[PDB]
Design a protein around this ligand. Structure first.
Ligand SMILES: O=C(O)CCC(=O)C(=O)O
Ligand SMILES: [Mn+2]
Length: 201
DNA sequence: AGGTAAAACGT
DNA sequence: AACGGTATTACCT
């Protein structure tokens, strides 16, 4: 195990990946990738979009799961069936058979892009896991503990890898180190990540 | 009283 | 470049 309640399913999504990427492109044709601006005024290096009922976003006052894309003023695209099916299968393999996600944050990393150590914090009256799917170029994933200075595990995540955490590890600090440039036959020059959560009801 | 920003420069 | 300061506060509910 990666941690209590956490596991990495290596290449779990490899067979599903071509279809997942087609569906990323479809989602992004409606809610485009955008680099969000933090409350403090800095533009994130990762470009993001969302699908499902709820999408993660920043704005002046903090972070928010929102049912509407603040850029388009339309609902986020519905969660693709390919995404939902893959998520369900991975969650079940990881020991979370009852997971019902309603939120998928899609990350796009260009060379140099990073995601500094953070926690995916608890949502009110909800304790569902996180399912996190890697596509395209490889990245170094940091996975720590409850405190920022708890020692980090560093794990290369390659195309098709799925990481799941929850329960005792649900609030662990994690992140991505600056992406190395490279080639991948399906994504060409980037890495995508899918982050599934239950954020509503 | 407690949660959230920093999911973002210096050594 | 891996580690850690910063929020050691300010501003909300
Ligand atoms: O890209 C990854 O593997 C992790 C992404 C992540 O932590 C997030 O979007 O919250
Ligand atoms: Mn995260």
């Amino acid at each position: 195990p990666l941690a209590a309640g956490a596991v990495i399913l290596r290449r779990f999504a490899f067979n599903a990946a071509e279809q997942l990427i087609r569906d990323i492109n479809d989602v992004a044709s409606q809610s485009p990738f955008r680099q969000m601006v933090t409350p403090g005024g800095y533009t994130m290096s990762v470009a993001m979009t969302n699908c499902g009922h709820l999408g993660w976003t920043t704005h002046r006052q903090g972070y928010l799961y929102s049912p509407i894309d603040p850029q388009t003023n339309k609902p986020w695209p519905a969660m693709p069936q390919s995404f939902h099916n893959l998520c369900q299968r991975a969650a079940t393999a990881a020991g979370y058979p009852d997971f019902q996600p309603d939120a998928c944050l899609i990350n796009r990393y260009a060379p140099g892009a990073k995601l500094c150590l953070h926690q995916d914090k608890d949502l009110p009256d909800l304790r569902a896991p996180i399912v996190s799917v890697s596509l395209g170029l490889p990245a170094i994933f940091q996975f720590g503990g409850l405190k920022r200075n708890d020692p980090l595990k560093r794990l290369l995540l390659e195309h098709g890898d799925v990481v799941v955490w929850g329960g005792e590890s649900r609030l662990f600090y994690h992140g991505i180190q600056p992406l190395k440039a490279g080639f991948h036959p399906l994504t060409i020059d980037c890495r995508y990540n899918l982050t599934f959560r239950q954020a509503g009801k």
